[PDB]
Amino acid sequence: MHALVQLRGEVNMHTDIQDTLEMLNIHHVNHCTLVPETDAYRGMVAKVNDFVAFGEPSQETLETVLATRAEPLEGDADVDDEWVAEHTDYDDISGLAFALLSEETTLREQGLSPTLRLHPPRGGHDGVKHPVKEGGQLGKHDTEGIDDLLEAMR
Amino acid sequence: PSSNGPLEGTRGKLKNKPRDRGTSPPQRAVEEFDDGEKVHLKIDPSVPNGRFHPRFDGQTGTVEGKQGDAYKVDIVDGGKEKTIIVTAAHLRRQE
Amino acid sequence: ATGPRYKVPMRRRREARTDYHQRLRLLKSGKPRLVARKSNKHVRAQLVTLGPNGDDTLASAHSSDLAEYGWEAPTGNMPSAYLTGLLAGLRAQEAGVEEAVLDIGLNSPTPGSKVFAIQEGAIDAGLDIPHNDDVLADWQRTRGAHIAEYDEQLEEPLYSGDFDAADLPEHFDELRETLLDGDIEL
Amino acid sequence: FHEMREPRIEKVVVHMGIGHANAEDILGEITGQMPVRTKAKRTVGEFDIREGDPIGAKVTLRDEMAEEFLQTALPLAELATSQFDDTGNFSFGLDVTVNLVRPGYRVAKRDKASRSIPTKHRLNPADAVAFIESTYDVEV
Amino acid sequence: KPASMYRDIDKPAYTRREYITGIPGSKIAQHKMGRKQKDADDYPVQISLIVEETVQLRHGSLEASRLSANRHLIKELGEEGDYKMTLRKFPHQVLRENKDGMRAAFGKIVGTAARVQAGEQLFTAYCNVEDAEHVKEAFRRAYNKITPSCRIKVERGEEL
RNA sequence: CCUGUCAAACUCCAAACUUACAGACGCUGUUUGACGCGGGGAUUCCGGUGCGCGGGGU
RNA sequence: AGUGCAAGAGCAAAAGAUGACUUGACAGUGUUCUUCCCAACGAGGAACGCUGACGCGAAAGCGUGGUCUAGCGAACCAAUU
RNA sequence: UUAGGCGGCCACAGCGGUGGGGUUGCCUCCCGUACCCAUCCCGAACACGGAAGAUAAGCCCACCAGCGUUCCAGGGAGUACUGGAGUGCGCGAGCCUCUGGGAAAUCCGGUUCGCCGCCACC
């Protein structure tokens, strides 16, 4: 399971790339989705490689992000341990987070919005013109590397 | 194109590779297809009779009946539905 | 053979056994082929339909399995030809085959020949094959009159082994009668 | 082994290449059978502008008709070494050509399942000289 | 005409003589120089002139560089010295010129050029150890009459 | 035999890629009716630029 | 090689060659593709049928002109069946 | 299939070459033209009739890789080329990095001297 974050806008972006991001329920900049690791899903993130930031999150980080940025399928309601317990198949946030990582279920399947609408990176990102291997913030990240971005986008 | 004829720009598609030269094997020329069957349209360069317009080479149509010995195959050209009269010699089964 | 551009003919064409141009025309009918072959000492007659991995033979008759019914004469002639054709057509009727088309292969369509006699046999067995009556031999040459009248120009016998002297085309009549019988183990 | 390997005469082809007939009579009388007309291909400037037109005649002789011709034809010519084919045939003279081969040439000349004769069963120039020399004449 | 009109490889490959007529002959005299009877393997030293950029060199430049290279080898080693130089590239690409304004713009044939890729050997001379600094100078004069910057690479020279 | 080079109108080879149909996931539609069909009204048929690939031309 | 003519393509017990016979280069009416990719538009063209009558062949079968892609013309008026 | 008939794929099956195999069996060559039929001339072929002889051809069987071919290994090569991205470099031509794909030639070594279907048959 990888976490996708659109870091580049829609203007001048190819339509077939734009539509892939819309298929991955990600419509704005700084938005985040939890995409599984299939052949079909990998073909999609590879096509989005230059306009996104992906990698596998740590259980600790996924939890932090879900607590602060997860929303129900409809409404303002804060997703806390009590919300999870009353609406999901799990006990707390950790139980849901473990399931998302082990690819047992999806946010949509549990009545949550497939999008974790994040805040801009505190202290800023490493740049949207170069990949991670060149010192930027585009493409595939380390598990420790994606956390730094996901946590900065609390 | 310098001309709008049927065989315009068809040097490649309507020519055989040297080893596939000469008369084609009869087994495929007398193949029996049933209605609803998905078939692959590809002209055999060795067979003169029963062809279609080269623009449809590569289509995968659906057999919807026959007209004499030739088959009436339903395809979709872009967005327009078309019915192609073609013999078995230029058809292969799907899957 | 020479290089990459060289075109090696289809196997049964290198072997000079199949006329692929005539085969395509034969298969166009949809009807099963009555394969009529002839060897020096023998005559073969098969009923072949088209299959997925090659041809299928549903009924056949070789002139060697003719002696199983009472033949004591040679097997590569006109009376033998008809009978091998009748025996093929009869087994065909038992297989559920009703109509056919004559495949003479690489043989010549010479009037009154053995391959046309094989066809006359199958027609008389109950099979519906598109023919032409005046391209077949007159009933006596099918019976074996030409051979008996060659033994009339005797001095020395025509046959080596002891079948008979003046030859009997009556054996043909007796054998056609044996096969026309409703009983018989086919 | 030897019986199905010993050479025989296939055909004795006698021909006269003129270029414009009256000479059909002399072939029929010397051979024993009927002659056939010979046409030509391509337009030539030596007043031979017509394609399908009689140039000469030929007669293909087989079996007894072949031997009964050669008993009177061979003494009319002094046979040489360089006058032989790689396949074991020879032409002399009025042209008289003799085709020689081993007892299984039907395999190459038939319709059903024909095959060309292997180089190990084909006749040699030496095996050709030896056969005709063993039939009333000399070599060299 | 300047080489600026023909040095780049931006045009399609135009070589098919069966469709191109009126092509001027090559100004190049010979590609094989020196002792063309002796082998290339008979020499301990092999030095090649390598082109650094991907360019199109005209027949006139190929000749002008070959001439001023071989003339130095003839001056220093004699007309029958123990060397052999080869010009391995041939002028295959046909050149046009539009010489009426831009209407019917496809030009008439004016010459021939050689498409040389970067890193390719234009010249290759085979010599003996003592004559090595003469051939390195023949190439220094030759690279001055073509379009790209060049390398003088010694392929069989452990003698230094 | 050896040795030196080429191809828009060459090919013993041969991609990336584009493309037909189908399945799967995704997304989407069944009160926001998609896909589609029928009808009313247009405007429009001087375009331009970047990037990629081009063809012509110094 | 040859296959009437550009060019590209097809063809070897043939689509080439020879020989013989024959007039389907037939009448009627269509389905379909093309002309006009997609996507509307005539004439023209082609593929593929059927009806009627025929030719050849032992027969399956082949013949809706020439192996395939150029060789074409509305209304009105006239002549013609 | 102790030698057969009709095929499918249509060179992995082609070209070339070596060894073996046939008494009433098979396939051939073979023997022979009264007939059916046959050659613009020839029973050569085609067609018909038949076994005196043979395994030399063919064919069937086993095998050889020199040539052509199929596929694979390792090297060439993750090179050539390339879909996506870049306020990376270069006067420029062009190059480079990241991401997703990925040849061809040639060399060396293996493979390949057909596979499969129906039928009939000591």
Ligand SMILES: [Cl-]
């Ligand atoms: Cl069509």
Ligand SMILES: [Cl-]
């Ligand atoms: Cl036969």
Ligand SMILES: [Mg+2]
């Ligand atoms: Mg909401």
Ligand SMILES: [Mg+2]
């Ligand atoms: Mg700040």
Ligand SMILES: [Mg+2]
């Ligand atoms: Mg920045």
Ligand SMILES: [Mg+2]
């Ligand atoms: Mg092309």
Ligand SMILES: [Mg+2]
């Ligand atoms: Mg008017």
Ligand SMILES: [Mg+2]
């Ligand atoms: Mg008139």
Ligand SMILES: [Mg+2]
């Ligand atoms: Mg043997």
Ligand SMILES: [Mg+2]
């Ligand atoms: Mg710059």
Ligand code: NA
């Ligand atoms: Na073919």
Ligand code: NA
């Ligand atoms: Na002007």
Ligand code: NA
């Ligand atoms: Na679906």
Ligand code: NA
């Ligand atoms: Na416009």
Ligand code: NA
């Ligand atoms: Na029309």
Ligand code: NA
């Ligand atoms: Na004549």
